[PDB]
From Swiss-Prot, chain A:
Subunit note: Homodimer. Dimers or tetramers in inactive state. On DNA damage, autophosphorylation dissociates ATM into monomers rendering them catalytically active. Binds p53/TP53, ABL1, BRCA1 and TERF1. Interacts with NBN (via FxF/Y motif). Part of the BRCA1-associated genome surveillance complex (BASC), which contains BRCA1, MSH2, MSH6, MLH1, ATM, BLM, PMS2 and the RAD50-MRE11-NBN protein complex. This association could be a dynamic process changing throughout the cell cycle and within subnuclear domains. Interacts with RAD17; DNA damage promotes the association.
Protein modification: Phosphorylated by NUAK1/ARK5. During the late stages of DNA damage response, dephosphorylated following deacetylation by SIRT7, leading to ATM deactivation. Acetylated in vitro by KAT5/TIP60. Deacetylated by SIRT7 during the late stages of DNA damage response, promoting ATM dephosphorylation and subsequent deactivation.
Parent-record interval covered: 1179 to 1581 of 3056
Expression by tissue: Found in pancreas, kidney, skeletal muscle, liver, lung, placenta, brain, heart, spleen, thymus, testis, ovary, small intestine, colon and leukocytes.
Family, as annotated: Belongs to the PI3/PI4-kinase family. ATM subfamily.
Protein name: Serine-protein kinase ATM
Effect of residue 264 to P: In AT; decreased phosphorylation of target proteins
Outcome reported for the amino acid change (mutating residue 1 to F): In a gastric adenocarcinoma sample; somatic mutation
Documented effect of changing residue 268 to M: In a renal papillary cancer sample; somatic mutation
Compartment annotation: Nucleus; Cytoplasmic vesicle; Cytoplasm, Cytoskeleton, Microtubule organizing center, Centrosome; Peroxisome matrix
Top-level taxonomy: Eukaryota, Metazoa, Chordata, Craniata, Vertebrata
Upregulation: By ionizing radiation.
Job description of the protein: Serine/threonine protein kinase which activates checkpoint signaling upon double strand breaks (DSBs), apoptosis and genotoxic stresses such as ionizing ultraviolet A light (UVA), thereby acting as a DNA damage sensor. Recognizes the substrate consensus sequence [ST]-Q. Phosphorylates 'Ser-139' of histone variant H2AX at double strand breaks (DSBs), thereby regulating DNA damage response mechanism.
Gene: ATM
Amino acid sequence: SVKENGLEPHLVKKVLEKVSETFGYRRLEDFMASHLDYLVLEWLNLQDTEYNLSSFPFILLNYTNIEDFYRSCYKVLIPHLVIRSHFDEVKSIANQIQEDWKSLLTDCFPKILVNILPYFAYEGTRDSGMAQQRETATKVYDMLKSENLLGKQIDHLFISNLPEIVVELLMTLHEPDLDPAPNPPHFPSHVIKATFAYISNCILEILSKSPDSYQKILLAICEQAAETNNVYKKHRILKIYHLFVSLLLKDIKSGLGGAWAFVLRDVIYTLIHYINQRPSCIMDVSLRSFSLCCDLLSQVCQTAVTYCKDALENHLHVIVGTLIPLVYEQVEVQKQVLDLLKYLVIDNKDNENLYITIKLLDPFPDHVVFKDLRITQQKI
Amino acid sequence: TYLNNTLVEDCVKVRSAAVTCLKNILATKTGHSFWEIYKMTTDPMLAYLQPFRTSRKKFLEVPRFDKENPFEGLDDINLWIPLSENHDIWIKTLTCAFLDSGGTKCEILQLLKPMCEVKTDFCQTVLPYLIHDI
Protein backbone atom coordinates (compact mmCIF):
# COMPACT_ATOMS: atom_id res chain seq x y z
CA SER A 1 0.00 0.00 0.00
CA VAL A 2 2.90 2.37 0.69
CA LYS A 3 4.23 1.52 -2.77
CA GLU A 4 1.03 2.11 -4.73
CA ASN A 5 -2.02 2.87 -2.55
CA GLY A 6 -0.48 6.23 -1.61
CA LEU A 7 -0.27 5.77 2.16
CA GLU A 8 1.79 8.58 3.65
CA PRO A 9 5.08 7.07 4.87
CA HIS A 10 5.12 9.25 8.00
CA LEU A 11 1.76 7.95 9.24
CA VAL A 12 2.89 4.38 8.50
CA LYS A 13 6.13 5.00 10.41
CA LYS A 14 4.14 6.41 13.34
CA VAL A 15 1.84 3.38 13.49
CA LEU A 16 4.74 0.94 13.10
CA GLU A 17 6.74 2.68 15.84
CA LYS A 18 3.77 2.53 18.20
CA VAL A 19 3.22 -1.16 17.42
CA SER A 20 6.91 -2.04 17.86
CA GLU A 21 6.82 -0.24 21.21
CA THR A 22 3.76 -2.32 22.11
CA PHE A 23 5.48 -5.62 21.24
CA GLY A 24 8.50 -4.68 23.38
CA TYR A 25 11.07 -4.15 20.63
CA ARG A 26 13.69 -1.58 21.57
CA ARG A 27 13.75 -0.02 18.09
CA LEU A 28 11.58 -0.18 14.98
CA GLU A 29 14.59 -1.32 12.94
CA ASP A 30 14.82 -4.60 14.86
CA PHE A 31 11.07 -5.19 14.54
CA MET A 32 11.14 -4.68 10.77
CA ALA A 33 14.34 -6.72 10.41
CA SER A 34 12.68 -9.66 12.16
CA HIS A 35 10.37 -9.95 9.12
CA LEU A 36 12.88 -8.81 6.48
CA ASP A 37 13.19 -12.22 4.79
CA TYR A 38 9.45 -12.54 4.17
CA LEU A 39 9.18 -8.94 2.96
CA VAL A 40 12.06 -9.29 0.50
CA LEU A 41 10.85 -12.68 -0.77
CA GLU A 42 7.30 -11.46 -1.37
CA TRP A 43 8.66 -8.26 -2.93
CA LEU A 44 10.79 -10.19 -5.43
CA ASN A 45 7.93 -12.64 -6.03
CA LEU A 46 5.91 -9.77 -7.54
CA GLN A 47 7.01 -10.29 -11.15
CA ASP A 48 7.16 -6.64 -12.16
CA THR A 49 9.96 -4.16 -12.82
CA GLU A 50 8.02 -1.63 -10.72
CA TYR A 51 8.47 -3.87 -7.65
CA ASN A 52 12.21 -4.50 -8.06
CA LEU A 53 14.74 -4.25 -5.24
CA SER A 54 15.55 -0.58 -5.89
CA SER A 55 11.90 0.45 -5.43
CA PHE A 56 11.55 -1.51 -2.18
CA PRO A 57 10.39 0.91 0.56
CA PHE A 58 13.40 1.33 2.83
CA ILE A 59 11.97 4.34 4.69
CA LEU A 60 9.76 1.99 6.73
CA LEU A 61 12.93 0.56 8.31
CA ASN A 62 14.30 3.99 9.34
CA TYR A 63 17.10 3.97 6.77
CA THR A 64 18.09 7.37 5.42
CA ASN A 65 19.69 6.26 2.14
CA ILE A 66 20.06 3.21 -0.08
CA GLU A 67 23.73 2.91 0.91
CA ASP A 68 22.99 2.46 4.62
CA PHE A 69 20.13 0.10 3.75
CA TYR A 70 22.57 -2.13 1.87
CA ARG A 71 25.17 -1.76 4.66
CA SER A 72 22.65 -3.12 7.14
CA CYS A 73 20.69 -5.68 5.09
CA TYR A 74 23.00 -7.13 2.43
CA LYS A 75 23.41 -10.27 4.56
CA VAL A 76 19.77 -11.07 3.78
CA LEU A 77 19.50 -9.40 0.36
CA ILE A 78 22.35 -11.30 -1.33
CA PRO A 79 21.10 -14.90 -0.76
CA HIS A 80 17.65 -14.02 -2.09
CA LEU A 81 19.15 -12.63 -5.30
CA VAL A 82 21.75 -15.37 -5.79
CA ILE A 83 19.17 -18.17 -5.63
CA ARG A 84 17.51 -16.39 -8.58
CA SER A 85 20.93 -16.14 -10.32
CA HIS A 86 20.69 -12.32 -10.41
CA PHE A 87 24.46 -11.95 -10.29
CA ASP A 88 24.44 -8.61 -12.11
CA GLU A 89 22.30 -7.21 -9.29
CA VAL A 90 24.72 -8.52 -6.57
CA LYS A 91 27.56 -6.96 -8.60
CA SER A 92 25.69 -3.64 -8.59
CA ILE A 93 25.11 -3.91 -4.83
CA ALA A 94 28.82 -4.55 -4.28
CA ASN A 95 29.74 -1.57 -6.47
CA GLN A 96 27.34 0.70 -4.57
CA ILE A 97 28.61 -0.58 -1.20
CA GLN A 98 32.27 -0.08 -2.30
CA GLU A 99 33.01 -3.62 -1.08
CA ASP A 100 34.21 -6.56 -3.16
CA TRP A 101 31.46 -8.89 -4.35
CA LYS A 102 33.54 -11.98 -3.57
CA SER A 103 33.70 -10.97 0.10
CA LEU A 104 29.93 -10.43 0.22
CA LEU A 105 29.27 -13.80 -1.43
CA THR A 106 31.61 -15.57 0.99
CA ASP A 107 30.05 -13.83 4.00
CA CYS A 108 26.52 -14.84 2.91
CA PHE A 109 27.39 -18.46 2.09
CA PRO A 110 25.29 -20.41 4.67
CA LYS A 111 22.11 -18.48 3.88
CA ILE A 112 22.76 -19.28 0.22
CA LEU A 113 23.20 -23.00 0.93
CA VAL A 114 19.97 -23.01 2.95
CA ASN A 115 18.07 -22.54 -0.32
CA ILE A 116 20.22 -25.11 -2.17
CA LEU A 117 21.18 -28.15 -0.10
CA PRO A 118 17.76 -29.47 1.09
CA TYR A 119 16.51 -29.68 -2.50
CA PHE A 120 19.48 -31.89 -3.32
CA ALA A 121 18.78 -33.83 -0.14
CA TYR A 122 15.23 -35.11 -0.68
CA GLU A 123 14.07 -36.53 -4.01
CA GLY A 124 11.61 -39.03 -5.47
CA THR A 125 8.56 -36.84 -4.89
CA ARG A 126 5.78 -36.62 -7.46
CA ASP A 127 5.45 -32.86 -6.86
CA SER A 128 6.48 -30.95 -9.98
CA GLY A 129 7.08 -27.72 -8.06
CA MET A 130 9.72 -29.36 -5.91
CA ALA A 131 11.23 -30.71 -9.14
CA GLN A 132 11.79 -27.22 -10.54
CA GLN A 133 13.02 -26.17 -7.08
CA ARG A 134 15.64 -28.92 -7.33
CA GLU A 135 16.49 -27.85 -10.89
CA THR A 136 16.97 -24.22 -9.83
CA ALA A 137 19.09 -25.30 -6.87
CA THR A 138 21.29 -27.46 -9.11
CA LYS A 139 21.77 -24.72 -11.71
CA VAL A 140 22.57 -22.10 -9.06
CA TYR A 141 25.05 -24.43 -7.37
CA ASP A 142 26.84 -25.27 -10.63
CA MET A 143 26.98 -21.57 -11.50
CA LEU A 144 28.63 -21.05 -8.11
CA LYS A 145 30.98 -23.92 -8.97
CA SER A 146 32.38 -21.99 -11.94
CA GLU A 147 35.86 -20.51 -11.56
CA ASN A 148 34.69 -16.95 -12.31
CA LEU A 149 32.98 -16.62 -8.91
CA LEU A 150 34.18 -18.47 -5.78
CA GLY A 151 36.51 -20.50 -8.00
CA LYS A 152 37.25 -23.98 -6.72
CA GLN A 153 37.59 -22.71 -3.13
CA ILE A 154 33.98 -23.71 -2.40
CA ASP A 155 35.17 -26.98 -0.83
CA HIS A 156 37.57 -25.26 1.58
CA LEU A 157 34.96 -22.63 2.43
CA PHE A 158 32.38 -25.34 3.12
CA ILE A 159 34.69 -27.49 5.25
CA SER A 160 36.05 -24.52 7.22
CA ASN A 161 32.65 -22.96 8.01
CA LEU A 162 30.35 -25.91 8.80
CA PRO A 163 28.74 -24.72 12.09
CA GLU A 164 27.20 -21.68 10.39
CA ILE A 165 25.59 -23.86 7.70
CA VAL A 166 24.43 -26.26 10.43
CA VAL A 167 22.75 -23.55 12.51
CA GLU A 168 21.22 -21.93 9.41
CA LEU A 169 19.74 -25.29 8.38
CA LEU A 170 18.43 -25.82 11.92
CA MET A 171 16.76 -22.40 12.08
CA THR A 172 14.39 -23.33 9.21
CA LEU A 173 12.43 -26.02 11.07
CA HIS A 174 8.63 -25.94 10.85
CA GLU A 175 6.86 -29.19 11.71
CA PRO A 176 3.40 -28.38 10.25
CA ASP A 177 -2.35 -25.72 14.11
CA LEU A 178 -2.51 -22.10 15.32
CA ASP A 179 1.25 -21.51 15.41
CA PRO A 180 2.40 -18.59 13.22
CA ALA A 181 4.33 -19.41 10.08
CA PRO A 182 8.10 -18.80 10.39
CA ASN A 183 10.42 -17.30 7.77
CA PRO A 184 9.94 -18.50 4.15
CA PRO A 185 12.13 -21.68 4.10
CA HIS A 186 9.68 -23.85 6.11
CA PHE A 187 11.65 -27.09 6.10
CA PRO A 188 10.25 -30.06 8.09
CA SER A 189 12.41 -32.36 10.21
CA HIS A 190 12.85 -35.19 7.70
CA VAL A 191 14.17 -32.92 4.95
CA ILE A 192 16.66 -31.50 7.47
CA LYS A 193 17.81 -35.03 8.32
CA ALA A 194 18.17 -35.69 4.59
CA THR A 195 20.25 -32.51 4.27
CA PHE A 196 22.54 -33.70 7.06
CA ALA A 197 22.87 -37.09 5.36
CA TYR A 198 23.64 -35.46 2.00
CA ILE A 199 26.31 -33.25 3.57
CA SER A 200 27.74 -36.38 5.20
CA ASN A 201 27.93 -38.19 1.85
CA CYS A 202 29.76 -35.29 0.18
CA ILE A 203 27.69 -35.36 9.52
CA LEU A 204 28.49 -35.50 13.23
CA GLU A 205 31.86 -37.09 12.40
CA ILE A 206 32.99 -33.95 10.56
CA LEU A 207 31.77 -31.82 13.47
CA SER A 208 33.57 -34.16 15.89
CA LYS A 209 36.77 -33.54 13.93
CA SER A 210 36.59 -30.04 15.48
CA PRO A 211 34.95 -30.69 18.87
CA ASP A 212 34.38 -26.97 19.53
CA SER A 213 31.59 -26.78 16.92
CA TYR A 214 28.79 -28.09 19.16
CA GLN A 215 29.51 -25.22 21.54
CA LYS A 216 29.04 -22.73 18.69
CA ILE A 217 25.74 -24.25 17.53
CA LEU A 218 24.38 -24.42 21.08
CA LEU A 219 25.53 -20.85 21.76
CA ALA A 220 23.80 -19.57 18.62
CA ILE A 221 20.55 -21.39 19.44
CA CYS A 222 20.56 -20.12 23.03
CA GLU A 223 21.41 -16.57 21.90
CA GLN A 224 18.49 -16.49 19.46
CA ALA A 225 16.27 -17.89 22.22
CA ALA A 226 17.42 -15.19 24.65
CA GLU A 227 17.01 -12.25 22.27
CA THR A 228 13.41 -13.35 21.67
CA ASN A 229 10.79 -11.87 24.01
CA ASN A 230 7.75 -13.57 22.43
CA VAL A 231 6.41 -17.05 23.20
CA TYR A 232 5.74 -18.48 19.73
CA LYS A 233 9.25 -18.09 18.34
CA LYS A 234 10.52 -18.99 21.82
CA HIS A 235 8.75 -22.35 21.50
CA ARG A 236 10.08 -22.64 17.95
CA ILE A 237 13.69 -22.13 19.06
CA LEU A 238 13.03 -24.67 21.81
CA LYS A 239 11.95 -27.09 19.06
CA ILE A 240 15.23 -26.51 17.19
CA TYR A 241 17.14 -26.99 20.46
CA HIS A 242 15.34 -30.27 21.14
CA LEU A 243 15.97 -31.49 17.59
CA PHE A 244 19.69 -30.73 17.70
CA VAL A 245 20.10 -32.21 21.19
CA SER A 246 18.30 -35.39 20.12
CA LEU A 247 20.52 -35.74 17.05
CA LEU A 248 23.61 -35.17 19.21
CA LEU A 249 22.47 -37.84 21.68
CA LYS A 250 21.94 -40.26 18.79
CA ASP A 251 25.73 -40.13 18.19
CA ILE A 252 26.71 -41.32 21.69
CA LYS A 253 29.46 -43.94 22.25
CA SER A 254 31.54 -41.99 19.72
CA GLY A 255 32.85 -39.53 22.32
CA LEU A 256 32.15 -36.49 20.10
CA GLY A 257 35.91 -36.08 19.84
CA GLY A 258 36.25 -35.79 23.60
CA ALA A 259 33.46 -33.19 23.78
CA TRP A 260 30.79 -35.38 25.40
CA ALA A 261 31.22 -34.17 28.98
CA PHE A 262 31.11 -30.46 28.11
CA VAL A 263 28.04 -30.73 25.89
CA LEU A 264 26.27 -32.95 28.43
CA ARG A 265 26.89 -30.44 31.21
CA ASP A 266 25.89 -27.50 28.99
CA VAL A 267 22.63 -29.15 27.92
CA ILE A 268 21.77 -30.16 31.49
CA TYR A 269 22.41 -26.66 32.85
CA THR A 270 20.55 -24.98 29.98
CA LEU A 271 17.50 -27.18 30.61
CA ILE A 272 17.71 -26.50 34.36
CA HIS A 273 17.86 -22.75 33.72
CA TYR A 274 14.89 -22.94 31.33
CA ILE A 275 12.89 -24.87 33.93
CA ASN A 276 13.79 -22.50 36.77
CA GLN A 277 12.65 -19.29 35.05
CA ARG A 278 9.12 -20.47 34.30
CA PRO A 279 6.76 -17.45 34.09
CA SER A 280 3.57 -19.35 34.92
CA CYS A 281 1.51 -22.39 33.92
CA ILE A 282 -1.65 -20.80 32.51
CA MET A 283 -0.75 -20.52 28.80
CA ASP A 284 -0.87 -23.59 26.55
CA VAL A 285 2.39 -22.82 24.74
CA SER A 286 4.16 -22.40 28.09
CA LEU A 287 2.97 -25.87 29.13
CA ARG A 288 4.15 -27.32 25.80
CA SER A 289 7.57 -25.72 26.29
CA PHE A 290 7.79 -27.02 29.87
CA SER A 291 6.84 -30.54 28.78
CA LEU A 292 9.39 -30.43 25.96
CA CYS A 293 12.14 -29.31 28.34
CA CYS A 294 11.26 -32.03 30.85
CA ASP A 295 11.22 -34.68 28.11
CA LEU A 296 14.61 -33.53 26.81
CA LEU A 297 16.08 -33.60 30.33
CA SER A 298 14.70 -37.10 30.93
CA GLN A 299 16.06 -38.38 27.62
CA VAL A 300 19.53 -36.90 28.12
CA CYS A 301 19.76 -38.18 31.70
CA GLN A 302 18.66 -41.67 30.65
CA THR A 303 21.12 -41.76 27.75
CA ALA A 304 23.99 -40.55 29.93
CA VAL A 305 23.33 -42.99 32.76
CA THR A 306 22.82 -45.94 30.40
CA TYR A 307 25.79 -45.42 28.08
CA CYS A 308 28.27 -43.81 30.48
CA LYS A 309 27.53 -45.18 34.00
CA ASP A 310 29.27 -41.98 35.15
CA ALA A 311 29.44 -38.23 34.37
CA LEU A 312 26.12 -37.81 36.20
CA GLU A 313 27.40 -37.77 39.80
CA ASN A 314 28.43 -34.12 39.38
CA HIS A 315 24.96 -33.16 38.11
CA LEU A 316 22.60 -35.47 40.03
CA HIS A 317 22.19 -33.17 43.04
CA VAL A 318 21.34 -30.05 41.02
CA ILE A 319 18.90 -31.99 38.81
CA VAL A 320 17.15 -33.43 41.87
CA GLY A 321 17.02 -30.03 43.57
CA THR A 322 15.51 -28.45 40.47
CA LEU A 323 12.97 -31.26 40.01
CA ILE A 324 11.76 -31.39 43.64
CA PRO A 325 9.70 -28.14 43.62
CA LEU A 326 8.03 -29.09 40.32
CA VAL A 327 5.80 -31.72 41.94
CA TYR A 328 3.44 -29.08 43.40
CA GLU A 329 2.31 -27.70 40.03
CA GLN A 330 -0.26 -30.09 38.47
CA VAL A 331 -0.61 -33.77 37.59
CA GLU A 332 0.45 -33.28 33.96
CA VAL A 333 3.99 -32.27 34.93
CA GLN A 334 3.88 -34.17 38.24
CA LYS A 335 3.75 -37.53 36.46
CA GLN A 336 6.87 -36.85 34.40
CA VAL A 337 8.76 -35.27 37.30
CA LEU A 338 7.96 -38.29 39.48
CA ASP A 339 8.91 -40.88 36.88
CA LEU A 340 12.15 -39.07 36.05
CA LEU A 341 13.02 -38.98 39.75
CA LYS A 342 12.08 -42.66 40.07
CA TYR A 343 14.40 -43.50 37.18
CA LEU A 344 17.20 -41.49 38.79
CA VAL A 345 17.06 -42.82 42.35
CA ILE A 346 14.60 -45.70 42.71
CA ASP A 347 15.60 -48.26 40.06
CA ASN A 348 19.26 -47.15 40.01
CA LYS A 349 20.50 -48.79 43.23
CA ASP A 350 22.30 -51.45 41.15
CA ASN A 351 25.05 -48.98 40.19
CA GLU A 352 27.85 -48.55 42.73
CA ASN A 353 29.28 -45.40 41.13
CA LEU A 354 26.17 -43.34 41.95
CA TYR A 355 25.51 -45.18 45.22
CA ILE A 356 27.60 -42.57 47.04
CA THR A 357 25.98 -39.78 45.02
CA ILE A 358 22.50 -40.83 46.16
CA LYS A 359 23.79 -41.31 49.71
CA LEU A 360 25.07 -37.71 49.80
CA LEU A 361 21.77 -36.14 48.79
CA ASP A 362 19.17 -33.94 50.43
CA PRO A 363 16.19 -35.76 51.96
CA PHE A 364 12.94 -35.65 50.03
CA PRO A 365 10.01 -33.60 51.38
CA ASP A 366 7.88 -35.50 53.89
CA HIS A 367 4.74 -35.78 51.77
CA VAL A 368 2.74 -38.72 50.47
CA VAL A 369 3.99 -38.23 46.89
CA PHE A 370 7.60 -38.76 48.00
CA LYS A 371 6.78 -41.82 50.13
CA ASP A 372 8.57 -44.38 47.94
CA LEU A 373 11.40 -41.94 47.24
CA ARG A 374 11.76 -41.18 50.96
CA ILE A 375 11.83 -44.89 51.83
CA THR A 376 14.48 -45.57 49.19
CA GLN A 377 16.55 -42.60 50.41
CA GLN A 378 16.36 -43.81 54.01
CA LYS A 379 17.30 -47.37 53.06
CA ILE A 380 20.21 -46.25 50.86
CA THR B 1 38.86 -22.52 37.22
CA TYR B 2 36.93 -19.24 37.34
CA LEU B 3 36.03 -19.44 33.64
CA ASN B 4 34.94 -23.08 33.91
CA ASN B 5 32.76 -22.11 36.88
CA THR B 6 31.21 -19.20 34.96
CA LEU B 7 30.56 -21.38 31.89
CA VAL B 8 27.29 -22.50 33.52
CA GLU B 9 25.71 -19.10 34.20
CA ASP B 10 22.17 -18.40 33.04
CA CYS B 11 23.12 -15.30 30.95
CA VAL B 12 24.38 -16.01 27.37
CA LYS B 13 26.80 -13.04 27.21
CA VAL B 14 29.43 -14.34 29.61
CA ARG B 15 29.49 -17.85 28.13
CA SER B 16 30.73 -16.57 24.76
CA ALA B 17 33.38 -14.47 26.52
CA ALA B 18 34.37 -17.47 28.65
CA VAL B 19 34.77 -19.81 25.68
CA THR B 20 36.75 -17.12 23.85
CA CYS B 21 39.04 -16.80 26.87
CA LEU B 22 39.50 -20.58 27.05
CA LYS B 23 40.33 -20.76 23.34
CA ASN B 24 42.84 -17.91 23.63
CA ILE B 25 44.52 -19.07 26.85
CA LEU B 26 44.78 -22.78 26.07
CA ALA B 27 46.68 -22.12 22.79
CA THR B 28 49.77 -20.39 24.25
CA LYS B 29 53.02 -21.39 25.94
CA THR B 30 51.53 -21.12 29.43
CA GLY B 31 48.43 -23.08 28.42
CA HIS B 32 50.51 -26.14 27.53
CA SER B 33 52.83 -25.61 30.50
CA PHE B 34 49.62 -25.84 32.55
CA TRP B 35 47.93 -28.79 30.80
CA GLU B 36 51.03 -31.05 31.00
CA ILE B 37 51.37 -30.47 34.78
CA TYR B 38 47.63 -30.64 35.47
CA LYS B 39 46.62 -33.65 33.35
CA MET B 40 48.19 -36.02 35.90
CA THR B 41 45.39 -35.21 38.38
CA THR B 42 41.71 -36.17 38.47
CA ASP B 43 39.24 -33.31 38.04
CA PRO B 44 36.10 -32.77 35.92
CA MET B 45 37.60 -29.55 34.53
CA LEU B 46 40.04 -31.71 32.55
CA ALA B 47 37.14 -33.34 30.70
CA TYR B 48 35.21 -30.07 30.43
CA LEU B 49 38.13 -28.21 28.79
CA GLN B 50 39.08 -30.98 26.33
CA PRO B 51 37.24 -29.53 23.28
CA PHE B 52 38.71 -26.03 23.63
CA ARG B 53 42.36 -27.11 23.44
CA THR B 54 43.91 -27.89 20.06
CA SER B 55 47.21 -29.24 18.74
CA ARG B 56 48.64 -26.61 16.40
CA LYS B 57 52.10 -26.28 14.87
CA LYS B 58 52.52 -22.71 16.16
CA PHE B 59 51.05 -21.82 19.55
CA LEU B 60 49.15 -18.55 19.90
CA GLU B 61 51.22 -15.45 20.64
CA VAL B 62 49.81 -12.29 22.22
CA PRO B 63 50.70 -9.00 20.48
CA ARG B 64 52.90 -7.14 22.98
CA PHE B 65 52.14 -3.72 21.55
CA ASP B 66 54.12 -0.96 23.28
CA LYS B 67 52.35 2.31 24.00
CA GLU B 68 54.29 5.46 23.12
CA ASN B 69 53.90 6.83 26.67
CA PRO B 70 52.65 4.57 29.48
CA PHE B 71 51.55 5.79 32.95
CA GLU B 72 49.11 8.21 31.27
CA GLY B 73 46.00 6.02 31.34
CA LEU B 74 46.40 5.36 35.06
CA ASP B 75 47.56 8.79 36.31
CA ASP B 76 44.02 10.22 36.35
CA ILE B 77 42.72 10.91 39.85
CA ASN B 78 39.13 10.40 38.66
CA LEU B 79 39.96 6.88 37.47
CA TRP B 80 41.37 5.78 40.83
CA ILE B 81 38.52 7.19 42.97
CA PRO B 82 34.85 6.38 42.24
CA LEU B 83 31.69 8.28 43.15
CA SER B 84 29.42 7.42 46.07
CA GLU B 85 27.61 4.89 43.87
CA ASN B 86 28.28 3.10 40.56
CA HIS B 87 31.11 0.78 41.60
CA ASP B 88 30.67 -1.53 38.59
CA ILE B 89 31.77 0.90 35.89
CA TRP B 90 34.56 2.19 38.15
CA ILE B 91 36.11 -1.25 38.61
CA LYS B 92 35.53 -2.12 34.94
CA THR B 93 37.25 1.06 33.74
CA LEU B 94 40.13 0.59 36.19
CA THR B 95 40.69 -2.99 35.04
CA CYS B 96 40.45 -2.01 31.36
CA ALA B 97 42.93 0.84 31.85
CA PHE B 98 45.31 -1.56 33.59
CA LEU B 99 45.03 -3.77 30.49
CA ASP B 100 45.79 -0.89 28.08
CA SER B 101 49.44 -1.69 27.27
CA GLY B 102 50.54 -1.10 30.87
CA GLY B 103 53.07 -3.77 31.77
CA THR B 104 51.44 -7.21 31.83
CA LYS B 105 54.29 -9.31 30.49
CA CYS B 106 52.18 -12.37 31.33
CA GLU B 107 50.51 -13.85 28.25
CA ILE B 108 47.35 -15.22 29.88
CA LEU B 109 46.66 -11.63 30.86
CA GLN B 110 45.63 -9.31 28.00
CA LEU B 111 43.38 -12.24 26.98
CA LEU B 112 40.77 -11.66 29.71
CA LYS B 113 39.51 -8.35 28.28
CA PRO B 114 36.06 -9.66 27.16
CA MET B 115 35.47 -11.40 30.49
CA CYS B 116 36.33 -8.19 32.34
CA GLU B 117 34.03 -6.26 30.00
CA VAL B 118 31.06 -8.57 30.62
CA LYS B 119 31.55 -9.30 34.35
CA THR B 120 32.41 -7.25 37.45
CA ASP B 121 33.30 -10.01 39.92
CA PHE B 122 35.92 -11.15 37.42
CA CYS B 123 37.40 -7.63 37.40
CA GLN B 124 37.54 -7.61 41.20
CA THR B 125 39.22 -11.02 41.18
CA VAL B 126 41.77 -10.16 38.49
CA LEU B 127 42.83 -6.65 39.59
CA PRO B 128 45.37 -7.82 42.25
CA TYR B 129 47.04 -10.10 39.70
CA LEU B 130 47.36 -7.21 37.24
CA ILE B 131 48.89 -4.98 39.92
CA HIS B 132 51.29 -7.71 41.04
CA ASP B 133 52.42 -8.47 37.48
CA ILE B 134 52.99 -4.78 36.73
